[PDB]
């Protein structure tokens, strides 16, 4: 009904648009260079560091793989 | 046939891409700092204020939760 | 095999990300201010002019309504 | 677990958000002007050159067509 359930702070702007895994993990990039994987309760599952801002929005493969781009020129494939 | 059904004014640019819930509510961010929830008929359901421009496009969880990023560095989870 | 099927010229950059109707129409916004609806064969079905750049990516409601944001501060609902 | 499966280098920033085909190809644009099609093992299937940065995120038709916008003002439809 438009109340905060929770808010996770990253180190920079979040322009990336979140994706949701089969188990409800939320994946989103940040200008702080990381891809984040966050649990449905608001805690960090893991974060993967790229060489640049992650403005790209993650996609999730059939086998759980997370793809997303970065400012650092690469497209990343990361295991869930 | 490409005719205006309605247009809902926010206080700034809308770069965010809208999402549509199971009940047809539309979720979209604006550079005015708000995430908006709008009824299919053009009237505001609720708006949630963030600390910055919402350029992220919202995603919707299986239980109705709306996730979006903000320029204020946070990832938000909001109840429907 | 990675060959051009066709290409449609708009009047400016296309930063928007295309959406696809049930009937195969492609929707996409452009810096030239317009949302385009384009037939699967490469020709214009209709175009709707907004007050500003359409960086927002269209979404399609269950009744065929196309929702998109504009730089002109509005979220638009357009009949298919 | 958050471990790199693989990373593909393009010639510039990847702001485009990856799309995944029915056959698991990953498609994504780059500031280097190309749309890339990459196999689930990390190797290039093919790349199509546009006149400008591809910040748009690709969408995929029911018939496998890949649609994406470009800074060069066009919407492109490309065969898989």
From TrEMBL, chains A, B, C, D:
The keyword Metal-binding applies. Cu(2+) 1 binds at residue 33. This is Cell surface protein. Residues 1-67 form the Pyrrolo-quinoline quinone repeat domain. Zn(2+) 1 binds at residue 33. One of its GO terms (biological process) is amino acid activation for nonribosomal peptide biosynthetic process. Zn(2+) 2 binds at residue 73. Cu(2+) 2 binds at residue 73. GO terms for molecular function: metal ion binding. Keywords: Metal-binding, Zinc.
